[PDB]
């Protein structure tokens, strides 16, 4: 026979190897596939889909339909934001439970950009202006309206549209501190006539084109 020489690695099974293997059923009638719609190539595609962030995880509001209903309540102009959110997509309970976030449990590194979308869940007759803010990493949560307003902010008029979208720029993982996303009463809620003074809002985060991942890990029990 041809002179051959056995090197280290022979007879050892690599869990994530790439070798050719002998087939148990030669010539089997493999049913060919059909164009069932729902063909995916990657996981990130699933992450560039909007997902209702369950902001409210209070004692009762955690694990019931209210976890998604961030009420615009009758209080004063107390500048401590209507909503607060820490940009730790996997290291933050509200973001770790998202479609995007679940995928972020399957890697150690994620990098790129994300986007927040808000649905105003109030009357056509109701109006007002709110403010969406993002202070990139380093900066702390901006405690007063002004502080957030000073930086990247979006003034969103209710009485003009129900759809608000503010994209988040550059970030990176190792699953320890990132950015923050916040909502503020720019103005306040204008109620027309005798209309329920406490309506809600719905937030949807989704990844950006530039968002991808690296180093595959897990967790199961």
């Amino acid at each position, epitope marked *: 026979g041809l002179p051959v020489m056995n090197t280290p690695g022979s007879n050892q099974y690599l869990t994530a190897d790439n070798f050719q293997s002998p087939c148990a059923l030669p010539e089997f009638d493999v049913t060919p596939p059909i164009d069932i719609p729902g063909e995916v190539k990657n996981m990130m595609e699933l992450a560039e889909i909007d997902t209702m962030i369950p902001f409210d995880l209070s*004692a009762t509001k955690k694990n019931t339909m209210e976890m998604y209903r961030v009420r615009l*309540s009758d209080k004063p102009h107390t500048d*401590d934001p209507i*909503l607060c*959110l820490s940009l730790s997509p996997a290291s933050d309970p509200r973001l770790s439970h998202t479609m995007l976030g679940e995928i972020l449990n399957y890697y150690t590194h994620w990098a790129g950009s994300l986007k927040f979308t808000f649905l105003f869940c109030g009357s056509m007759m109701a109006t007002g202006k709110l403010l969406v803010s993002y202070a990139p990493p380093g900066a702390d949560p901006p405690k007063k309206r002004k502080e957030a307003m000073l930086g990247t902010h979006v003034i969103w008029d209710i009485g003009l549209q129900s759809s608000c979208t503010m994209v988040v720029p550059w970030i990176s993982n190792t699953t320890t501190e990132g950015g923050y996303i916040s909502v503020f009463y720019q103005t306040r809620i204008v109620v027309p006539l005798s209309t329920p003074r406490e309506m809600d809002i719905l937030g949807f985060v989704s990844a950006c084109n530039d968002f991808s991942v690296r180093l595959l890990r897990d967790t199961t029990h």
Partner: nanobody
Amino acid sequence: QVQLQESGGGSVQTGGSLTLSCAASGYAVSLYSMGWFRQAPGKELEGVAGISSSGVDTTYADSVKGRFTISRDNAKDTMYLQMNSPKPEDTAIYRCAAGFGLSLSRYTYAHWGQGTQVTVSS
């Protein structure tokens, strides 16, 4: 992870001074700000008190300012909710975990503790 464990609650003669605690079973106890939410039977868990990230700010609800007190222990994790002079409405279920804010539970520090029922009986 910081997992919060609530202590300090129960019955008191209306007009006492109940100090309520909440141990942080995690490193970043120095995390964010802090707070105490109360919820009446079937009613919402409104933001009562709050302290800062360091343990410096003092933020209270309209009812509770002047009497209620909050103080997070840096060294020994737990924040102290001292309900100076508790009243009939202070007969609510108390919760903790409010780092990054006050006012509403519609935000703050999501990972919330269980619960302790305070019954102001005079």
